[PDB]
Design a protein around this ligand. Structure first.
Ligand SMILES: Cc1cc2nc3c(=O)[nH]c(=O)nc-3n(C[C@H](O)[C@H](O)[C@H](O)CO)c2cc1C
Ligand SMILES: Cc1cc2nc3c(=O)[nH]c(=O)nc-3n(C[C@H](O)[C@H](O)[C@H](O)CO)c2cc1C
Lengths: 266, 270
């Protein structure tokens, strides 16, 4: 059995599709395969907010469920529905996909067409959270609106910023087109290498481009070439205008405060 | 520094004005304020196309530039120049306005007057695009001719239809404002849903005018929710059908051509 989609973020509505896949694969006495389409069609249009994560990170998470295969957008956008099935679904008796699933040139290949080729299609219904249908768009919009506290209910975890490298470690997220947080300051959990975990105050601001710098608390050292994973827990204050050190001393102050708060929350 | 105008549709000329206001504000180490005048006087005269957007939408955009305050045209068209300056410009060293700026009774208030009162007034040359000066009135003209593809060059983005949602098609209620009406017909639109989700759709302008949008690859109810539609391309002229089937045939057609153009757009990026 094969599930097919982009799965950017691998939010709870995706976890739905994938848990139903494994179930279905069990009662069909079949293997499990995840086909993750590298980029959605909108990824190319000018106003795309950007992906919640790199394709590589997404694959790491998808692989936690089943063998994962990346379908290259460039390699499949031009195929006809027939060609798609012939090249990617030979010997596949069933695919699991979200509602309104489409594929092939001009989105002419749908679940209906797949059935006409004798492939059973398990159309999974969207998961709704607080009257809203979970999705990458919705979650992508919160990231932009800096509404980070509101994310878990849709993503299954805190939105993350991942990359390399008062002082402040500048996070280079890579060359993928990733979504950007509302410019401003954030309270973040920092996963350093060696399982280490420290809190941090992260500022997000211009340089078009966006920059990610974090002041990690209770930690000197340098991560210059290392990779960091940041959990964006809370939005503190919007970006500002050299009394810098002042505010970036109260952010760090408010930080300890919220942190000691979480701690007493035994 | 202060910026003054109607700013219907905040086109690129309007944006030139607002950016100038911002540079001058950054320069003098002063704050910015935009006075948007609810309606142009032509709005209350015979045969006016209608705004490109509701004052509410306009203030939403302008607001992204700086503190914005709306001024009732009726509440200031009767003031005298002095009244207006006495009422809105105290302590203001500079005003930024477009061309042919006018205010007060018998449009006797102009940039000359404001200057005399000790306030510097930078008038901005209209922006020219393809040998035409950008202007709300021009853009309103494209809309009516259905020349939606040509608009971004001037407007600075696609023309939009916004409102409440009054096979499955969403009827859009634009509101009770006098909004310019698109040429009757079928259009390709980019639907901007409530969540944050973007879906293409096929819109129909038939017959006040009625706007309907068939959203592609989407299912659910939107009664009571807002929709923002980028009107991307005019596909075909509305037609009169003498057989209920010929219509569904065509509607079926439209989404078909829609999907081809949607693919074209995506592959054009390379
Ligand atoms: C916690 C924290 C908050 C910050 N907040 C801001 C800010 O509000 N505005 C700003 O211009 N720079 C801010 N910065 C500046 C940033 O570190 C860096 O010096 C600039 O981006 C360099 O152009 C902040 C840095 C930290 C560590
Ligand atoms: C894509 C699309 C195209 C349409 N084209 C027409 C048309 O050409 N002529 C017409 O009378 N109604 C047209 N309609 C109207 C619709 O089928 C129905 O008659 C009205 O909504 C009734 O108020 C269209 C609807 C859609 C979604």
């Amino acid at each position: 059995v094969v599930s097919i989609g982009v799965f950017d973020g691998v939010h709870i509505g995706h976890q739905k599709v994938l848990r139903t896949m494994k179930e279905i694969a069990f009662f069909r006495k079949d293997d499990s395969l995840i086909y993750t389409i590298s980029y959605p069609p909108e990824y190319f249009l000018p106003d795309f907010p950007g992906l919640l994560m790199t394709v590589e990170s997404r694959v790491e998470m998808l692989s936690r469920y089943a063998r994962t295969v990346v379908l290259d957008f460039f390699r499949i956008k031009d195929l006809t529905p027939e060609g798609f099935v012939e090249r990617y679904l030979s010997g596949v008796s069933a695919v699991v996909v979200g509602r309104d699933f489409r594929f092939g040139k001009n989105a002419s290949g749908n679940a209906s067409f797949l059935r006409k080729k004798g492939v059973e299609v398990y159309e999974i219904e969207d998961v709704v959270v607080q009257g809203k249908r979970v999705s990458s768009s919705l979650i992508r919009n919160l990231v932009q609106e800096g509404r980070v506290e509101e994310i878990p209910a849709y993503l299954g975890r805190y939105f993350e910023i991942e990359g390399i490298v008062f002082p402040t470690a500048n996070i280079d997220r890579g060359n993928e087109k990733l979504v950007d947080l509302k410019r401003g300051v954030y309270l973040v959990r920092v996963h350093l290498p060696d399982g280490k975990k420290k809190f941090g105050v992260m500022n997000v601001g211009f340089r078009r481009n966006v920059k990610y710098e974090v002041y990690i608390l209770d930690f000197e050292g340098d991560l210059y070439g290392q990779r960091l994973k940041l959990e964006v827990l809370k939005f503190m204050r919007d970006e500002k205008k050299e009394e810098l050190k002042a505010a970036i001393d109260q952010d760090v102050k408010s930080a300890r405060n919220m942190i000691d708060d979480i701690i007493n929350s035994k």
